[PDB]
Amino acid sequence: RQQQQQLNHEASELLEIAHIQDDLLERLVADPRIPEERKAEIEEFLDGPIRTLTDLFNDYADQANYYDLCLLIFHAADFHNPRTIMDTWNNLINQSHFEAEQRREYWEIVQAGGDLPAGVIAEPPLPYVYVSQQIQLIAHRTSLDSLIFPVNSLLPVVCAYAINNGQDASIGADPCWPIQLFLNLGVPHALMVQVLENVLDTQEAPFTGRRRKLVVQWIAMAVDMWVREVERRGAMAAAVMGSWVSELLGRADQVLTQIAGTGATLRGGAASDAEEIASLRRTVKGLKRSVDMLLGGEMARMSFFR
Amino acid sequence: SNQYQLPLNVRPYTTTWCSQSPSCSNLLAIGHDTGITIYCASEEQTPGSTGLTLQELFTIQTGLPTLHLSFSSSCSYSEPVYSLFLACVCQDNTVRLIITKNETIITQHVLGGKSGHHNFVNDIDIADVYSADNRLAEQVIASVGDDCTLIIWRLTDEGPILAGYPLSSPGISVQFRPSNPNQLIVGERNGNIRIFDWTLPWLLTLNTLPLVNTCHSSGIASSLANVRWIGSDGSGILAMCKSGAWLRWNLFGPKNLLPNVQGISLFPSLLGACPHPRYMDYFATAHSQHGLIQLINTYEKDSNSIPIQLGMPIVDFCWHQDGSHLAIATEGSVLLTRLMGFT
Amino acid sequence: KLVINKDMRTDLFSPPN
Amino acid sequence: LETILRDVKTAFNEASSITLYGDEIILVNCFQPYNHSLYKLNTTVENWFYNMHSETDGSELFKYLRTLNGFASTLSNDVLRSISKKFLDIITGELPDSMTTVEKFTDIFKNCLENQFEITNLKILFDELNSFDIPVVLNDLINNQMKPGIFWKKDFISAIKFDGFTSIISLESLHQLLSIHYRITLQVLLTFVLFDLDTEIFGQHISTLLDLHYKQFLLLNLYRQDKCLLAEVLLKDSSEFSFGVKFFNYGQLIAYIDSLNSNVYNTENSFFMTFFRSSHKNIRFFLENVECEVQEFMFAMTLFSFDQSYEIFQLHDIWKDLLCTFTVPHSAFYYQLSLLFDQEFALKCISKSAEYSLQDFKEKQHIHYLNLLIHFEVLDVLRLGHECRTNFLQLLLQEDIDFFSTLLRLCNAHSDKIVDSILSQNLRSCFKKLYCFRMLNAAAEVLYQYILMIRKRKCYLMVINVLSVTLTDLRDELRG
């Protein structure tokens, strides 16, 4: 069995590298922004024996700014470097945002009569939709167990992008879209709330001032899903949550009381979000109630008939 | 090193030994988000590696954050009962003197509002002043803030005497002179350093900004971190910039024309220098953000000594009076570490 | 085994020789 | 960096040619594109500044300034900074308005100057100082040289379009002038703290100087904090000259710079704080400084962008939200703060406001408080409160559903209509039976019987104990 596994493992690693190399070669040959003279040179060195991950990264993936394949390379190489990983995530998000904005612009010109730039093939997804498509494609290929998904660093970055680029209600997007994304991808509920707590305590920009209203809304949505999950898992077994989650919702209520007060005394006139915040207060209290009941004994009596 | 945990919900802001009063020098106070906690340091048998362990005695609840903390000479022990006097700064921008018998606050004085500082308070210190007859005549607290004010708050026999003095810039540190309570030092953010006789213009102003050796440019913004007296007669003055640049002047003989010595720490010193209570030429400074501590010798005996590196940020630190032990508050704990060389 | 070396590469956007 | 920056600058500035801008303006064009040097005719005061160690002759005022500099130049930078700070403190009130001038000067002396200078230089300065007719020289310095002129508009050619060149040349020139002013003002003030000059006779001058020093400091601070912003607020200050200026000779230029000086020494502070808010760190010095009702609120919103902020705000009484809050004018303010930090500050403010207040507002506040508490008792409180929007409560309890159960148990223990019914319905929506029973403490019995229609024995038993006809039936069933 040992000799079998060692060969199955060598073939699995070399197959992972080979697919990366094939994805690169195909993309480079098809890229409009690559001169023909270079493409023939790329085809010579990549359509043959499998190359090392260093070369694939330095000589090709990094030169062409294929940041998604850079991340797959950091995964195949067991690359321990959080800072470079996050730099690559930041470049991939920004590159995709600019590409989505460009395609929506070209569209708006068609729907208005103008002419596109020469050699531009004529309702493309909003930028936050194309961005999260890129995150999904990588996650399914790396399985979320990778070091290219440090949720403690990657979730705040994605939330930062949503704020600093208005990927919120103004354009008709769900303001909780970053949370939906990582939950559906299979991030455990406890880890989400744990990170969101750290976002709220440290107050790193842009998560500052009255925009912590949005952080509280993410916490509300995450805890809500967590509660639903626990209730579902209890019914499941008929046929972890600590007091820290309750404390976190209390502080969240205090943040909302602070934001509303500051909003009422702003220069130029009171803030327009008065009832929007009052609603969030009710939701947060409802969640603290549910969490308090579960913590207080209703969680050990979930498999029992009522 | 031995490590002693602070309570789980206690965030430390400041750490100081009761070196100011020999009766209580084994008392350690931690100012935190709900008050001030007192620990006792004792010689266990241990191994005589760290022949010193920390025993947590009690916690004084105040209900709000404590950012700066100073024991007074008035501290005493009895059998058992501790009689404490603490100067500190609170979240309401008040400066307070709290007098206790153990964890129970029997007495409290508060200086705040408009009569107090008109901006953030950056530093505080306390000294006991006695008359000629040698009863306790006054307790004197000095504090500096971002309202460009230095405040001298005297608590006397016939009651409080308040005085304010204007500064050319925010006050970032203040400390009475050792063996001479008639003199004190005040630090301005801009690099100005004031020597002051409060019993009385104020006697003298040095400045570190224009003195930077510039062999290595200390940078555009070299905001003054700290100035402290050194020696037991307060024979000297040491100033440290955020940049790590430090300078030392002595006060005796003949005429003087420049600072006596100058250097630069390996790292920035957000918290400033903490001079050794026994070896004038030595002081400690932290890279608070990465959790390293450099030990510097003024006459260059040092050659970059970094006895302390944690894998965590350092919130504050201070020397035990014995000169071989260090107490360090980090974000969730206090460590007592013994450097074998100083024994 | 990966080794990043941004120093000396080959200009991916320039022909050879 | 220090060195490379200096060298790069120096390189970029290598001189190449002369251009006579306007009629008579000497301009030098540098090796690096976008780099030019203007050579500006000095004003009187500038000539004094730039020729201390030279001017053979000079007027009385010059000689006076030279001697003041002769003393002040022996002090170090740290000392001088600490003195400047103290002079700010006199205006900010950090040196209380309660003190006499003599007392503030004494404070300053003891803290900053004592032991920090050579007594020999003091003697030199005192001697030299005794030759001057001080009131006259200070009069000429303050009221002629430094305090600029009232204009009846003296033709500063109004620019039709933004002129970036004249913009930066103006700002740099202003900065040089005010830096020089700053150094002079500080040296004179210094002489006022060191010697027994009648604090009453010179009371006017002293307060003018402390007023001027302060303004100087502020400007210079803003200059190095954000030049673009400073220029923008300083040119949108003058209405007719909103776009900028043109100058074709040295007189027009000097006159424009002086004009801006006037602006600084005399509507500006508000326009600039407003534009800024719409330089975080500086405005702390300058909300401790420049603030000393309106200043209070400014201090609040500035210190929020947390303890100090909340305290000040309460004691007294993003931009869009602030405007809304102003229009509303405590509840609104706290709600806004909470929203903006959504954290400790937020939660605290929200809780405090909610407490001080106690359909939409109520519900929102309640929900927020409950959520914050469950994140960090609260449940029972809110419930009893609202009882004394039913579906809302149904949803809140829906979120609540272990901690919730514990809280309910606690409430029941304490006790030992609408609320009861809602609870029963939610519970009806092992575990289930238990919760139902606990709450109803008939409902229990009914639920158990329904579920039954080891487990059997346990149920029958529980029923019999609770009842203590039914018992007989249960016994017979267990025996059958």
mmCIF file of N, CA and C in Angstrom, chain A residues 175-233:
data_model
loop_
_atom_site.group_PDB
_atom_site.id
_atom_site.type_symbol
_atom_site.label_atom_id
_atom_site.label_comp_id
_atom_site.label_asym_id
_atom_site.label_seq_id
_atom_site.Cartn_x
_atom_site.Cartn_y
_atom_site.Cartn_z
ATOM 1 N N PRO A 175 -26.683 44.227 0.504
ATOM 2 C CA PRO A 175 -25.548 44.759 1.276
ATOM 3 C C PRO A 175 -24.760 43.695 2.011
ATOM 4 N N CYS A 176 -25.355 42.531 2.259
ATOM 5 C CA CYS A 176 -24.676 41.424 2.919
ATOM 6 C C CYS A 176 -23.999 40.478 1.937
ATOM 7 N N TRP A 177 -23.854 40.871 0.668
ATOM 8 C CA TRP A 177 -23.357 39.932 -0.329
ATOM 9 C C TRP A 177 -22.002 39.327 0.027
ATOM 10 N N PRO A 178 -21.070 40.027 0.681
ATOM 11 C CA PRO A 178 -19.816 39.357 1.054
ATOM 12 C C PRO A 178 -20.023 38.208 2.025
ATOM 13 N N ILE A 179 -21.005 38.320 2.921
ATOM 14 C CA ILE A 179 -21.251 37.280 3.911
ATOM 15 C C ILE A 179 -21.925 36.075 3.266
ATOM 16 N N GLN A 180 -22.958 36.324 2.459
ATOM 17 C CA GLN A 180 -23.590 35.261 1.681
ATOM 18 C C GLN A 180 -22.549 34.435 0.939
ATOM 19 N N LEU A 181 -21.620 35.117 0.267
ATOM 20 C CA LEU A 181 -20.614 34.440 -0.543
ATOM 21 C C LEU A 181 -19.820 33.432 0.278
ATOM 22 N N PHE A 182 -19.222 33.869 1.388
ATOM 23 C CA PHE A 182 -18.334 32.973 2.124
ATOM 24 C C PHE A 182 -19.102 31.897 2.885
ATOM 25 N N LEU A 183 -20.359 32.148 3.253
ATOM 26 C CA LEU A 183 -21.153 31.098 3.884
ATOM 27 C C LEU A 183 -21.488 29.994 2.889
ATOM 28 N N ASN A 184 -22.064 30.360 1.737
ATOM 29 C CA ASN A 184 -22.369 29.360 0.717
ATOM 30 C C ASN A 184 -21.127 28.576 0.328
ATOM 31 N N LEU A 185 -19.968 29.236 0.291
ATOM 32 C CA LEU A 185 -18.731 28.537 -0.025
ATOM 33 C C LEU A 185 -18.376 27.503 1.032
ATOM 34 N N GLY A 186 -18.984 27.582 2.210
ATOM 35 C CA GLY A 186 -18.777 26.602 3.252
ATOM 36 C C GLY A 186 -17.870 27.025 4.386
ATOM 37 N N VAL A 187 -17.688 28.319 4.611
ATOM 38 C CA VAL A 187 -16.965 28.772 5.805
ATOM 39 C C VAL A 187 -17.836 28.510 7.032
ATOM 40 N N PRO A 188 -17.310 27.897 8.096
ATOM 41 C CA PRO A 188 -18.156 27.607 9.264
ATOM 42 C C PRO A 188 -18.649 28.885 9.927
ATOM 43 N N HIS A 189 -19.883 28.831 10.437
ATOM 44 C CA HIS A 189 -20.525 30.027 10.980
ATOM 45 C C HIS A 189 -19.723 30.637 12.127
ATOM 46 N N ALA A 190 -19.187 29.808 13.025
ATOM 47 C CA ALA A 190 -18.452 30.351 14.162
ATOM 48 C C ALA A 190 -17.262 31.183 13.703
ATOM 49 N N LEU A 191 -16.568 30.734 12.657
ATOM 50 C CA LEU A 191 -15.389 31.459 12.192
ATOM 51 C C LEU A 191 -15.749 32.812 11.600
ATOM 52 N N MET A 192 -16.894 32.910 10.929
ATOM 53 C CA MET A 192 -17.367 34.180 10.384
ATOM 54 C C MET A 192 -17.591 35.199 11.489
ATOM 55 N N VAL A 193 -18.449 34.841 12.447
ATOM 56 C CA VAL A 193 -18.730 35.730 13.571
ATOM 57 C C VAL A 193 -17.439 36.101 14.287
ATOM 58 N N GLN A 194 -16.515 35.149 14.402
ATOM 59 C CA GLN A 194 -15.261 35.412 15.100
ATOM 60 C C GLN A 194 -14.474 36.506 14.396
ATOM 61 N N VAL A 195 -14.381 36.428 13.068
ATOM 62 C CA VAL A 195 -13.696 37.462 12.301
ATOM 63 C C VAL A 195 -14.450 38.782 12.406
ATOM 64 N N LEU A 196 -15.756 38.758 12.133
ATOM 65 C CA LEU A 196 -16.551 39.980 12.183
ATOM 66 C C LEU A 196 -16.418 40.677 13.526
ATOM 67 N N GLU A 197 -16.282 39.910 14.611
ATOM 68 C CA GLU A 197 -16.015 40.522 15.904
ATOM 69 C C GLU A 197 -14.706 41.301 15.876
ATOM 70 N N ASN A 198 -13.658 40.716 15.292
ATOM 71 C CA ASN A 198 -12.376 41.405 15.236
ATOM 72 C C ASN A 198 -12.448 42.643 14.355
ATOM 73 N N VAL A 199 -13.259 42.605 13.297
ATOM 74 C CA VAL A 199 -13.452 43.789 12.462
ATOM 75 C C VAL A 199 -14.060 44.917 13.279
ATOM 76 N N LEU A 200 -15.009 44.586 14.154
ATOM 77 C CA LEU A 200 -15.752 45.601 14.888
ATOM 78 C C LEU A 200 -14.952 46.183 16.045
ATOM 79 N N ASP A 201 -14.055 45.401 16.642
ATOM 80 C CA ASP A 201 -13.302 45.872 17.797
ATOM 81 C C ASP A 201 -12.151 46.785 17.389
ATOM 82 N N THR A 202 -11.432 46.440 16.319
ATOM 83 C CA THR A 202 -10.204 47.151 15.972
ATOM 84 C C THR A 202 -10.459 48.440 15.197
ATOM 85 N N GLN A 203 -11.601 48.554 14.530
ATOM 86 C CA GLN A 203 -11.985 49.767 13.811
ATOM 87 C C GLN A 203 -10.895 50.214 12.832
ATOM 88 N N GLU A 204 -10.551 49.309 11.921
ATOM 89 C CA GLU A 204 -9.634 49.607 10.827
ATOM 90 C C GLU A 204 -10.419 50.123 9.628
ATOM 91 N N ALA A 205 -9.895 51.162 8.987
ATOM 92 C CA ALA A 205 -10.585 51.741 7.841
ATOM 93 C C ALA A 205 -10.733 50.696 6.743
ATOM 94 N N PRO A 206 -11.863 50.720 6.019
ATOM 95 C CA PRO A 206 -12.940 51.710 6.116
ATOM 96 C C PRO A 206 -13.968 51.439 7.225
ATOM 97 N N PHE A 207 -13.768 50.395 8.031
ATOM 98 C CA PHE A 207 -14.755 49.991 9.038
ATOM 99 C C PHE A 207 -14.661 50.923 10.249
ATOM 100 N N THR A 208 -15.090 52.166 10.041
ATOM 101 C CA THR A 208 -14.944 53.194 11.062
ATOM 102 C C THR A 208 -16.130 54.144 11.025
ATOM 103 N N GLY A 209 -16.273 54.904 12.105
ATOM 104 C CA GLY A 209 -17.333 55.892 12.180
ATOM 105 C C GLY A 209 -18.679 55.221 12.073
ATOM 106 N N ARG A 210 -19.519 55.759 11.202
ATOM 107 C CA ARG A 210 -20.886 55.284 11.073
ATOM 108 C C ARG A 210 -21.014 54.141 10.085
ATOM 109 N N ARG A 211 -19.955 53.832 9.336
ATOM 110 C CA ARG A 211 -19.950 52.646 8.486
ATOM 111 C C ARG A 211 -19.868 51.351 9.287
ATOM 112 N N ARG A 212 -19.582 51.423 10.587
ATOM 113 C CA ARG A 212 -19.725 50.251 11.437
ATOM 114 C C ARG A 212 -21.178 49.815 11.548
ATOM 115 N N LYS A 213 -22.112 50.665 11.137
ATOM 116 C CA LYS A 213 -23.485 50.231 10.927
ATOM 117 C C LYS A 213 -23.524 49.006 10.026
ATOM 118 N N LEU A 214 -22.736 49.027 8.952
ATOM 119 C CA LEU A 214 -22.737 47.924 7.999
ATOM 120 C C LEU A 214 -22.092 46.683 8.595
ATOM 121 N N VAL A 215 -21.030 46.865 9.382
ATOM 122 C CA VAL A 215 -20.406 45.736 10.068
ATOM 123 C C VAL A 215 -21.416 45.055 10.987
ATOM 124 N N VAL A 216 -22.219 45.845 11.705
ATOM 125 C CA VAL A 216 -23.228 45.267 12.591
ATOM 126 C C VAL A 216 -24.253 44.479 11.783
ATOM 127 N N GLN A 217 -24.601 44.972 10.592
ATOM 128 C CA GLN A 217 -25.565 44.252 9.760
ATOM 129 C C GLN A 217 -25.008 42.909 9.306
ATOM 130 N N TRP A 218 -23.709 42.855 9.009
ATOM 131 C CA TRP A 218 -23.084 41.583 8.654
ATOM 132 C C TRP A 218 -23.105 40.619 9.832
ATOM 133 N N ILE A 219 -22.773 41.107 11.025
ATOM 134 C CA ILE A 219 -22.830 40.261 12.215
ATOM 135 C C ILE A 219 -24.245 39.740 12.423
ATOM 136 N N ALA A 220 -25.245 40.608 12.260
ATOM 137 C CA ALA A 220 -26.632 40.185 12.421
ATOM 138 C C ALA A 220 -26.976 39.054 11.466
ATOM 139 N N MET A 221 -26.502 39.142 10.234
ATOM 140 C CA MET A 221 -26.835 38.157 9.223
ATOM 141 C C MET A 221 -26.106 36.846 9.485
ATOM 142 N N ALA A 222 -24.855 36.945 9.939
ATOM 143 C CA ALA A 222 -24.066 35.749 10.210
ATOM 144 C C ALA A 222 -24.626 34.981 11.401
ATOM 145 N N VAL A 223 -24.881 35.677 12.513
ATOM 146 C CA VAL A 223 -25.447 35.025 13.695
ATOM 147 C C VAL A 223 -26.808 34.425 13.367
ATOM 148 N N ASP A 224 -27.604 35.125 12.556
ATOM 149 C CA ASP A 224 -28.915 34.608 12.172
ATOM 150 C C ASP A 224 -28.787 33.254 11.484
ATOM 151 N N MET A 225 -27.901 33.155 10.500
ATOM 152 C CA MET A 225 -27.664 31.886 9.823
ATOM 153 C C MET A 225 -27.154 30.839 10.809
ATOM 154 N N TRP A 226 -26.276 31.257 11.725
ATOM 155 C CA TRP A 226 -25.761 30.329 12.731
ATOM 156 C C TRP A 226 -26.893 29.772 13.584
ATOM 157 N N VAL A 227 -27.811 30.639 14.024
ATOM 158 C CA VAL A 227 -28.955 30.183 14.809
ATOM 159 C C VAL A 227 -29.780 29.187 14.003
ATOM 160 N N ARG A 228 -30.099 29.533 12.754
ATOM 161 C CA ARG A 228 -30.857 28.622 11.900
ATOM 162 C C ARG A 228 -30.137 27.290 11.734
ATOM 163 N N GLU A 229 -28.811 27.322 11.609
ATOM 164 C CA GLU A 229 -28.047 26.086 11.481
ATOM 165 C C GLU A 229 -28.178 25.224 12.732
ATOM 166 N N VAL A 230 -28.051 25.836 13.912
ATOM 167 C CA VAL A 230 -28.160 25.078 15.160
ATOM 168 C C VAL A 230 -29.554 24.480 15.300
ATOM 169 N N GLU A 231 -30.590 25.263 14.976
ATOM 170 C CA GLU A 231 -31.957 24.758 15.041
ATOM 171 C C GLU A 231 -32.160 23.605 14.071
ATOM 172 N N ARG A 232 -31.558 23.702 12.885
ATOM 173 C CA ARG A 232 -31.657 22.632 11.901
ATOM 174 C C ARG A 232 -30.903 21.393 12.357
ATOM 175 N N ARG A 233 -29.702 21.578 12.908
ATOM 176 C CA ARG A 233 -28.921 20.446 13.391
ATOM 177 C C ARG A 233 -29.592 19.764 14.579
#
